[PDB]
Amino acid sequence: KFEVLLGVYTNAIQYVRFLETALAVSCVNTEFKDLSRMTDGKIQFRISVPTIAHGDGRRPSKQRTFIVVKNCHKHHISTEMELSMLDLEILHSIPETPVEYAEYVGAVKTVASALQFGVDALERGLINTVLSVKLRHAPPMFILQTLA
């Protein structure tokens, strides 16, 4: 028997990605997919400097290619996803009855919700690490303006 009509309000949460946000302009981001393959922390920079053809002094010089080396920082974020037990038990046993299809869809919905909170937490930790390594290597303006 229908006994009450209760109204609940589910909160609408913005799920952000690292590409949907706009500080991805600053970072050219790639899928390395196995970060253990790079064991050397230092990346070799081959800065090649061009030259102006001076005819007046006649002091000819080829390009001065110098090499500096720079460290590659690595960061490690970890969140946890909480998938319940009974919904995974529903998800393993795929049913054929059209009355258990609804319970399967409910289990899929709550498992996808917990996965979406975990994935959104990882894509909010990516943005936090990117902001941290931007603000670590950002000098103030009052020095950099006249230095650069």
């Binding site: 050219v28 790639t30 050397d40 230092k42 990346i43 070799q44 080396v69």
Partner: peptide, 23 residues
């Protein structure tokens, strides 16, 4: 350095289908 005794067969470009600069 890192290539103190090693040959290199090829390299891996940073998704640049026509550019040779970058990592």
């Amino acid at each position: 350095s890192a290539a103190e005794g090693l040959f290199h067969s090829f390299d891996l470009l940073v998704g640049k289908d026509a550019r040779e600069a970058g990592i």
